[PDB]
Amino acid sequence: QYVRIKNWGSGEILHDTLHHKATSSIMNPKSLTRGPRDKPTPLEELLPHAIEFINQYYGSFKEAKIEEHLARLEAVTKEIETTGTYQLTLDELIFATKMAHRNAPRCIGRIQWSNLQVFDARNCSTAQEMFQHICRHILYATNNGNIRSAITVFPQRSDGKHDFRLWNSQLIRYAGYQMPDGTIRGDAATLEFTQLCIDLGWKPRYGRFDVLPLVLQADGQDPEVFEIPPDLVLEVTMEHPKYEWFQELGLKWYALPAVANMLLEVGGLEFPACPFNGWYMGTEIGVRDFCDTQRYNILEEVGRRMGLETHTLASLWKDRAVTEINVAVLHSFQKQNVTIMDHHTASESFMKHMQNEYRARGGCPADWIWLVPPVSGSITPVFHQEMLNYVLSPFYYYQIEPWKTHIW
């Protein structure tokens, strides 16, 4: 029938009908999602996929180890024949995690795809044991502000009813509540989820930079709530380098961008819990987290303190404020020795990458909509670059929100 369409600012959804009369930019397309299941992967699908992967892994060395490649193929088949899926070698998980990042069409930082730290936590079985690993991860990646790229891989899905997974969008992340004023405090984005932590007994601190708790589900079991040891969450306080009134704003952001809720797919296997992290590109904080109507929405407050024509849209005052907010974020990171890269530098880098990729392996999955920064479009190189967006393997899939499917 029709097609549901979302505006993510207003939250308004519309149903398209006109398209049916057609001839001859969705955030979460089904195509980009790998959902739950109730039964192990069938063997007839699993095997071909595993073989494909093992042939990629071996076809990716400089000087081919044929015998080990033939052996591994044999051992993998026997394991599948014998157990009903198969485990990756560590020296295969590491490749899996790097190629999949390499294959994420929506990621600008892929120049760095080779430098990834991999934490093998496939032996995990309890919540407390997940939450320990998560803590280790955070501390490694954070490095006292010198951000290291890392990923923590938990036990692969088996039957689908013993799934490990984080209910958090990203590891470290601020809360948001629907205060009485008609207003909303903290991070509007996490409004719905904040409530859920409340439903599981998390004490609401009611502020605007409250780090939310990890909500961990292990081996299919109901999710237990863990608070993050505030010693690990490193934050950057926001000061402008001119407008001394900019600290009066009382702004800060967490330093670690660690996406928590995506699924890894490799050789037919699926890991619905594999949190990863790079570092921040300024605009992420300065433009989206700070300036989105859906988010912290500082744009008017900052403009007002600039003596700007705030009620005349043509004044271009948003263009002026946004830019200073970025300047602030950037400046606050460098000050405080927190790793960061500005979107301009980021765009030139990605470009080098892309060039590299095509000479390397003739292509680069790439989603224009996502790879162009939310300010300065035309001004970065990636805007003028035509690109194709395709899904390869291994790959990092979105997933249906855990509370929409989990049975407590």
Ligand X SMILES: C[C@H](O)[C@H](O)[C@H]1CNc2nc(N)[nH]c(=O)c2N1
| Residues annotated in a binding site | 25, 107, 170, 279-280, 284, 288, 369-370, 383, 398
| Smallest separation, CB 327 to ligand X (Å) | 20
Work out what residue 400 binds among ligand X, a copy of itself, ligand HEM, none; the CB cut-off runs from 5 to 8 Å by kind. Answer: none
Task: Give the separation between CA 52 and CA 9, rounded to whole angstroms.
Answer: 42
| Smallest separation, CB 311 to ligand HEM (Å) | 23
Query: How many residues bind to ligand X according to rule CB under 6 A?
Result: 9
Q: Is 107 one of the annotated active-site residues of the chain?
A: yes
Q: Is 284 one of the annotated active-site residues of the chain?
A: yes
H or E element in which residue 352 lies: helix 343-361
Question: Is residue 320 close enough to count as binding a copy of itself by CB under 8 A?
Answer: yes
Q: Is 279 one of the annotated active-site residues of the chain?
A: yes
DSSP code at position 182: S
Q: Is 12 one of the annotated active-site residues of the chain?
A: no
Token digits of residue 336: 């405080």
- Catalytic site residue from 110, 157, 185, 295: 110
**Residue written as token pair 């950057």:** 236
Task: Give the separation between CA 158 and CA 152, rounded to whole angstroms.
Answer: 18
Q: Pairing between strand 117-120 and 269-271? A: unpaired
- Catalytic site residue from 239, 284, 324, 357: 284
Question: Which of 109, 155, 268, 394 is close enough to bind ligand HEM by CB under 6 A?
Answer: 109
Buried b (16+ CB within 10 A) or exposed e, 195-210: ebbeeeebeeeeebbb
**Residue written as token pair 């040891």:** 229
Token digits of residue 44: 């007839």
- Catalytic site residue from 113, 202, 253, 279: 279
Question: Is residue 239 close enough to count as binding ligand HEM by CB under 6 A?
Answer: no
H or E element in which residue 186 lies: strand 185-186
Question: Is residue 58 close enough to count as binding a copy of itself by CB under 8 A?
Answer: no
Interface residues toward ligand X, by CB under 6 A: 8, 25, 27, 369-370, 383-386
Interface residues toward ligand HEM, by CB under 6 A: 101, 104, 106-109, 112, 116, 149, 151, 259, 262, 276, 278-279, 281, 284, 341, 396
